[PDB]
Design a protein around this ligand. Structure first.
Ligand SMILES: *[C@@H]1O[C@H](CO[C@@H]2O[C@@H](C)[C@@H](O)[C@@H](O)[C@@H]2O)[C@@H](O[C@@H]2O[C@H](CO)[C@@H](O[C@@H]3O[C@H](CO[C@H]4O[C@H](CO)[C@@H](O)[C@H](O)[C@@H]4O)[C@@H](O)[C@H](O[C@H]4O[C@H](CO)[C@@H](O)[C@H](O)[C@@H]4O)[C@@H]3O)[C@H](O)[C@H]2NC(C)=O)[C@H](O)[C@H]1NC(C)=O
Ligand SMILES: *[C@@H]1O[C@H](CO[C@@H]2O[C@@H](C)[C@@H](O)[C@@H](O)[C@@H]2O)[C@@H](O[C@@H]2O[C@H](CO)[C@@H](O[C@@H]3O[C@H](CO[C@H]4O[C@H](CO)[C@@H](O)[C@H](O)[C@@H]4O)[C@@H](O)[C@H](O[C@H]4O[C@H](CO)[C@@H](O)[C@H](O)[C@@H]4O)[C@@H]3O)[C@H](O)[C@H]2NC(C)=O)[C@H](O)[C@H]1NC(C)=O
Ligand code: HEM
Ligand code: HEM
Ligand SMILES: *[C@@H]1O[C@H](CO)[C@@H](O)[C@H](O)[C@H]1NC(C)=O
Ligand SMILES: *[C@@H]1O[C@H](CO)[C@@H](O)[C@H](O)[C@H]1NC(C)=O
Ligand SMILES: *[C@@H]1O[C@H](CO)[C@@H](O)[C@H](O)[C@H]1NC(C)=O
Ligand SMILES: *[C@@H]1O[C@H](CO)[C@@H](O)[C@H](O)[C@H]1NC(C)=O
Ligand SMILES: [Ca+2]
Ligand SMILES: [Ca+2]
Lengths: 104, 466, 104, 466
C-alpha cells in the first residue's frame, strides 16, 4: 500500500492500511457467528434426505413461503409514510454493498 | 448438472423441492433453480465453507464505478480529458444520457421482448437492468457524475480527466453516503435503533472491521417486503402515463427495452416518488409478483424470491433465528407461546412452529421479517440490530467516510450537507416537480411535492483550486 | 451427530452440536482480529526487501532477541514461589490445546 | 530444497535473517531455519491466509489419547479387553511402563545419542519427546490411565475394553481440567485476572466458541520465560542424582535415551517438584539454552526460540502490540514515555522503540512478556487477557466439561474434587515423598514436601455400576 494516496482505489484495497483487503472486492465475507452446515463444514441443511437440524425436520423453503409469505394481493397495504423510492434506494444501496457470485 | 434445466441435486446445484399441493407447481418432480454461491476455498476438507463478496463493502458508489479495475476503466470515457463516464452511443432519453449496453453471452434482457432487441445495460454492478426502476437510479447517478465533472472543469481548468473523474466520483460517493445515513437508514431503523446502533460519528477508527457480514447479505433482503406488484409510470402532471401506467413486475424484470423505448427514466422516477411503498405486515409479507413469478420471462420457470432467500441462508451456513437473537442480546423464545409474545402474534408463531418445530431453526430472513416493526421504522429488533451493526462498521471503518477529518474541507462539508436525492433528480432529468424532503417518506402528489426552483443546487465553489 | 453420547469423540467433532467442527482437530484457528500480511492476504512482514510495516522497518526477530531477550545466565532469578513443575504443566497443557502443522 | 539445510527464502520457507555483527552467526547471509505454518487454504488468491490446529482445542487429554482416529486406535492395547493404552515392549522403568516407541522417518531422538539408538516416543501428541521432563508427564498420565482402567475393571467385571478405556479416559481428561483450572491458571493469571476472565462456572453455553485463537498459540508461549537452562534430576532423598544431576537443556531436547537409559521418570519428576522455575524479569526474559542453542544436537545450527516466536507471529499475520492492547480494552502507548509508564520500565521501553520504532509494531510475544507481572501471577495485563479469555471459552464451550450436568454424577464430582498431581505421582512412580499442594508453588525440599501416605487415593466407589 502507498504511504500516501488521494482517493479510493477501485477495489477498496488499502482503505485499511494494517489489513489492506478489508472491505476490498473478491474476498470472503466476515462471519459474525460460527457457520451451521449439515455436515459441520460444507453441506446445506436440507441437502440429505432425512437429516434433521437441531432435532427437527428441515422445512422446504418453498413450503415456508407457501404457508407464511403467500397472501392475496387485494389485501396489500400501501405504506402511507414511505414512498416506493424507499424500496428502490434499498436495492441500489445493497448493490453498492454486496454481490455473492455463483457459477454459470 | 445444469442447475437451470435440471432438478438433480448435485454440485453446484441445490434446487428447491416442491411440496405436495403447491399452489403453482403441481408437478413435484419439478423444482425452483438454485446455484450454490461460490465457496471462498473450493474443494477443501479443512476450511468451513464461506462465500465471496465481489464488491467493495464501503458506501463508495461502486455500483456506479465498478469494484474491479478492468470494469472501472471500461465504464469511463477515455476519448478525452473530461473525466466522464461512458454513455449509450445508440440511444438517448429525451437528449439525456443512457447507460452503455453490455455484451453478455446469454443476455436476459433480450428475452423480455424478442422484437425490441435491447440488451442489458453496462454499469459498475451487474444487476443494473434487473428492474427499470433500479436502472433509472443507476442512470440518474451516471448523469450526476458527468454533470459534476463538467462543472469542476469550469472551476478548475488545469484538472486533467483523471482528476475530474476522481473528484466527481468522490462527490457522488459522498452523496450516496449522505442520502443513506441522513435520510434512508433512520426510516429503516426507527429513532431508537438509529441512536443505539448509529451514535454520532466521531472519526475514522482503523480497528473497526468494514467487511460485509455474511448474515447481512440475507438480512438486508428485508426490502423484498417493500416491493409493490407493479412498476408505476406517471407523466409531467403525475397522472398515469398511458398506454401502460402500471406494468406487472413479472414483465419488467431485465426489461431494459422499457427504459429505451417507453419514455426513458423520468416516468419511472415520478412513479417512485408519488407511489407508496408496500407495507410489511405479518400476514402480508411479500407479493406473488416476486413469490410466484420472479424472472418468469427470462427462464424456464418463475422463481420464488422469499423461498430463494431461505435456501440461500442455508447455502451460506447461517445460524437460525434464536442464534441471531442471542448475538443481538435479544431474548430467545423456545415455546410457541414465547415466540407469540416476541412477535406480538400467536397466529404467526404457530405457523412458524408448524414449519420449523422450534424458533432455533427459523431461517434468518423469515424470522427477521416476521418481527413487528419498530416505531417509525420498517424492521423489527433483530433486523435492526443486524442492519444497524453493519452500517456503523461501514461508517466508522472507512478511511474515506465523508466526515472523516482530511477527506473534505469544512466548507466542502458544509456544501455537501445541502445535497438531496430530490435535487439530484432536478439536476439530471426533465422532471421539474419532485418530492419534499424526506423523499423516502413523501409519497403523495401534490401534497408532498415542491418545485425544483426552491431547492438550492450543490455549490462547488469550495472545490476551486485557485 | 448422534442424539445422545456418553463420551467425547477422539477428533472433538460433535462437542458443539449446531457447529460440530468447533474445537475439532485439523480445522483453522479462529482469529480474534483481522490478519496483517505484507500484501494483505499471505506474505509475512519481513518477506520483501524494503517493505515497511506501518511506516517503520520490520525488526529482525533475531535482532530483537539479541538486544532485548539476551541476558547473562548467572543473573537468572529462581522463582521463590513457583516450581519448575509450573513450567512443565504449561507445556504439557499447551500440547493438549494446539499444534500448528508445518511441511516436512 | 529444505528449510533446515538452506537459507533460500522460497515456499515453504521463511528463514530468519541474521543481523549485522551477530554474536553467534558470523556470516550475515546465512539464517535461522523456519518453515511457514501450513495454510488452511493452500495456494488461494481469495482467502486471507490462516493456519491449522491439528489438535482438539478442548482440555480433554488429547496429548495422551490422540486427536485423530487411526492414531487413537494405535495408542491402545487391542490384544485384550482391559481398555489399556499400549506400553513399550522393549523397556521398562524399574518395573513401570514407558511410552511405546514411534516410527519416524527422520527420527530426531536418534541424533541426540547416536550409539544408544533410542527413537522418539509415540504419544497422543507428536512432541512428547521434545524434553525428558515433558516425556515424564506423558508417561505419568499413561500409567494413570492404565491404573484407572485396572481399578474400574475390578469394580465392574462385566465392563468390556471399550467401556474401560472410555471411563478411564474420561477420568484422566477431568484430572487435567481440575489441575489446570484449580491449581495452574490462578498462579498464571493472578487473583484479579482470575476473577475477571474466569468467573464461577454456571453452565455449558453452546454459543461459546471453544476454538483456539491464532494469537493464543503465540501468547501462551509466555512459558518460555519460565524455562531453566538445565534438566535437574534428584534421587530417592531429593539430593543430586550422580553423575549428571544438572544436564544443560541443549543436550536434553529429543533425548528419549535419557528416560530409557538414565534412570526413568522418577529422578526427572523429583527435579521438577523441588527446583524453582525461572522468574521472568524485564532484563532476564529467556535463557541462551533456548535462545542460542535450541535443538543444537538435531539441527545444523542452534535455533533461537524467542526469535522463532516472533517470526511465527509474522508468519501467522498477527497484529502488533497496540492492536492486542486495544482488543483487550487496555490503553495503547504511542510514545516511548507512555510505553515506559505501561511497562513501569522506561529503559525497556527505550530498548523496544529502538528495535521496533513504534509500539504498534512490537510483536505480541515480545510486548506481552515485557509487561510487569500481575500480583501473584506470572503474566502482565495483555497476556492475562488473551490467556484468560481463551480458557473461559475452553471451559464454557465444552459440552464435556467435568462440572457440566450430565457428565459426571454429583458423587463422582465429589470424588474428582479430591484429585491432585502429587497423588497421581504417588500412584504411578517409585516416589514416596511429593510436594504439598499447590504443587506449582511448592519448590523446596524438605519444607514443601510430605509423605505420599498422608494423601488419600481417588475414591472410585461411585463408578460402580449398580
Ligand atoms: C452464552 O455465551 C454467549 C457468548 O458470550 C461471550 O463469550 C463468553 C465466554 C463470555 O465471555 C461472554 O461475556 C461473552 O459475551 C453469549 O452471547 C453473547 O451475548 C452478548 C450480550 O448479549 C452479545 O453481545 C451483544 O452483541 C450485539 C451484536 O454486536 C456484537 O458483534 C459485533 C460483530 O462481531 C461486534 O462488532 C459488537 O461489538 C458486538 O460484540 C451488540 O449489538 C450488543 O451491544 C449493544 O447492546 C448492549 C446492551 O444494550 C450495549 O451495551 C451496546 O453498547 C450495544 O448497544 C452486545 O454487545 C454477543 O454478541 C453474544 N455472542 C454470541 C456468540 O451470541 C450468551 O449471552 C451466553 N448465555 C448465557 C446464558 O451465558
Ligand atoms: C475502535 O473500534 C474498536 C472496535 O469497536 C467495536 O466496533 C465499533 C463499531 C463499536 O460498535 C464498538 O462499540 C465495538 O466495540 C474498539 O475496540 C474494541 O474495544 C472494546 C472495548 O474495549 C473491546 O472489548 C473488550 O474485549 C476484550 C476481549 O474480549 C473480546 O473478544 C472476545 C473474542 O472475540 C469475545 O469473546 C469477548 O466477548 C470480547 O468481545 C474483553 O476482555 C473486554 O471485556 C472485559 O472487560 C470489560 C471492561 O472491564 C468488562 O466489562 C467485561 O465484563 C470483560 O471483563 C471487552 O469486551 C473490543 O475487543 C475491541 N475491539 C477491537 C477490534 O480492538 C476501539 O476501542 C475503538 N476505538 C475508539 C477510539 O473508538
Ligand atoms: C426489483 C427488485 C428486486 C429484485 C428483482 C431482487 C431480486 C433478488 C434476487 C434474485 C436475489 C438473489 C436470490 C437468491 O438468493 O437466489 C436478491 C438478493 C438480494 N437482494 Fe433483492 N431484489 C430486489 C430488491 C431488493 C431490495 C429492495 C433490497 C434491499 C432493500 C434487496 C436486497 C438484496 C440483497 C442484499 C441481496 C443479496 C445480494 C448479494 O448477492 O449479496 N433486494 N434479490
Ligand atoms: C521443554 C521446553 C520447551 C520447548 C523445547 C519448547 C519448544 C517450542 C518450539 C520449538 C515451538 C515452535 C517454535 C516456532 O514457532 O518455530 C514452541 C511452540 C509453542 N510453545 Fe514452547 N517449548 C517449551 C516449553 C513451553 C512452555 C512451558 C509453554 C507454555 C507454558 C510453551 C508453549 C508453546 C506454545 C503454545 C507453542 C505453540 C504450539 C503450536 O504449535 O500451536 N512452550 N515451543
Ligand atoms: C465521450 O464524451 C464526448 C463529449 O461529451 C461524447 O461526445 C462521446 O460520445 C463520449 N463517448 C462515450 C463512449 O461515452
Ligand atoms: C416489444 O417492443 C416493441 C418495440 O420494438 C413494442 O412496440 C412492443 O409493444 C413490445 N412488446 C411487448 C409484448 O410489450
Ligand atoms: C497389553 O496388555 C497386556 C496385559 O497388561 C500386556 O502384557 C501387554 O504387553 C500389552 N501390550 C501392549 C502392546 O501394550
Ligand atoms: C550415550 O548412551 C550410552 C548408553 O547407551 C552412554 O553410555 C553414553 O554416556 C551416552 N553418551 C553421552 C554423550 O552421554
Ligand atoms: Ca461499495
Ligand atoms: Ca485437546
Amino acid at each position: 500500500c502507498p504511504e500516501q494516496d488521494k482517493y479510493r482505489t477501485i477495489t477498496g484495497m488499502c482503505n485499511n492500511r494494517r489489513s489492506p483487503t478489508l472491505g476490498a472486492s473478491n474476498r470472503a465475507f466476515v462471519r459474525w457467528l460460527p457457520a451451521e452446515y449439515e455436515d459441520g463444514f460444507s453441506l446445506p441443511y436440507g441437502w440429505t434426505p432425512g437429516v434433521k437440524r437441531n432435532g427437527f425436520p428441515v422445512a422446504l423453503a418453498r413450503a415456508v413461503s407457501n404457508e407464511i409469505v403467500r397472501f392475496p394481493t387485494d389485501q396489500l397495504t400501501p405504506d402511507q409514510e414511505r414512498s416506493l423510492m424507499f424500496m428502490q434506494w434499498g436495492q441500489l444501496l445493497d448493490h453498492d454493498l454486496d454481490f455473492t457470485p455463483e457459477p454459470a | 448438472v445444469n442447475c437451470e434445466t435440471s432438478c438433480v441435486q448435485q454440485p453446484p446445484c441445490f434446487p428447491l423441492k416442491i411440496p405436495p399441493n403447491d399452489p403453482r407447481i403441481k408437478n413435484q418432480a419439478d423444482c425452483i433453480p438454485f446455484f450454490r454461491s461460490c465457496p471462498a476455498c473450493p474443494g477443501s476438507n479443512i476450511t468451513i465453507r464461506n462465500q465471496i463478496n465481489a464488491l467493495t463493502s464501503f458506501v463508495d458508489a461502486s455500483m456506479v464505478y465498478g469494484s474491479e479495475e478492468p470494469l472501472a476503466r471500461n465504464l469511463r470515457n477515455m476519448s478525452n480529458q473530461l473525466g466522464l463516464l461512458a454513455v449509450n452511443q445508440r440511444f438517448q432519453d429525451n437528449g439525456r444520457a443512457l447507460l452503455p449496453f453490455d455484451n453478455l453471452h446469454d443476455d436476459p434482457c433480450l428475452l423480455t421482448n424478442r422484437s425490441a432487441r435491447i440488451p442489458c445495460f453496462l454499469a459498475g454492478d451487474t444487476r443494473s437492468s434487473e428492474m427499470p426502476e433500479l436502472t433509472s437510479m443507476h442512470t440518474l447517478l451516471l448523469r450526476e457524475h458527468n454533470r459534476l465533472a463538467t462543472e469542476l472543469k469550469s472551476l478548475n481548468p488545469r484538472w486533467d480527466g483523471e482528476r475530474l473523474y476522481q473528484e466527481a466520483r468522490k462527490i457522488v460517493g459522498a452523496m450516496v453516503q449522505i442520502i443513506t445515513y441522513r435520510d434512508y437508514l433512520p426510516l429503516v431503523l426507527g429513532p431508537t435503533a438509529m441512536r443505539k446502533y448509529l451514535p454520532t460519528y466521531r472519526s475514522y477508527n482503523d480497528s473497526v472491521d468494514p467487511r460485509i457480514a455474511n448474515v447481512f447479505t440475507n438480512a438486508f433482503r428485508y426490502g423484498h417486503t417493500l416491493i409493490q406488484p407493479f412498476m408505476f409510470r406517471l407523466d409531467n402532471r403525475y397522472q398515469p402515463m398511458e398506454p401502460n401506467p402500471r406494468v406487472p413486475l413479472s414483465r419488467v424484470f431485465f426489461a431494459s427495452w422499457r427504459v429505451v423505448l417507453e419514455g426513458g427514466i423520468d416516468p419511472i422516477l415520478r412513479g417512485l416518488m408519488a407511489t407508496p411503498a408496500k407495507l410489511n405486515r405479518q400476514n402480508q409479507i411479500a407479493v406473488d409478483e416476486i413469490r410466484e413469478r420472479l424472472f418468469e420471462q427470462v427462464m424456464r420457470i418463475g422463481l420464488d424470491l422469499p423461498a430463494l432467500n431461505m435456501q440461500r441462508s442455508r447455502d451460506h451456513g447461517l445460524p437460525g433465528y434464536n442464534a441471531w437473537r442471542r448475538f443481538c442480546g435479544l431474548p430467545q423464545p423456545e415455546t410457541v407461546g414465547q415466540l407469540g409474545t416476541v412477535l406480538r402474534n400467536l397466529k404467526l408463531a404457530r405457523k412458524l412452529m408448524e414449519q420449523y418445530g422450534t424458533p432455533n431453526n427459523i431461517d434468518i430472513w423469515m424470522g427477521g421479517v416476521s418481527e413487528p416493526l419498530k416505531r417509525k421504522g420498517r424492521v423489527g429488533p433483530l433486523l435492526a440490530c443486524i442492519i444497524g451493526t453493519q452500517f456503523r462498521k461501514l461508517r466508522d471503518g472507512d478511511r474515506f467516510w465523508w466526515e472523516n477529518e482530511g477527506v473534505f474541507s469544512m466548507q466542502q462539508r458544509q456544501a455537501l450537507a445541502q445535497i438531496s436525492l430530490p435535487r439530484i433528480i432536478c439536476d439530471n432529468t426533465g422532471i421539474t416537480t419532485v418530492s419534499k424532503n424526506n423523499i423516502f417518506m413523501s409519497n403523495s402528489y401534490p401534497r408532498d411535492f415542491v418545485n425544483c426552483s426552491t431547492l438550492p443546487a450543490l455549490n462547488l465553489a469550495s472545490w476551486r483550486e485557485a
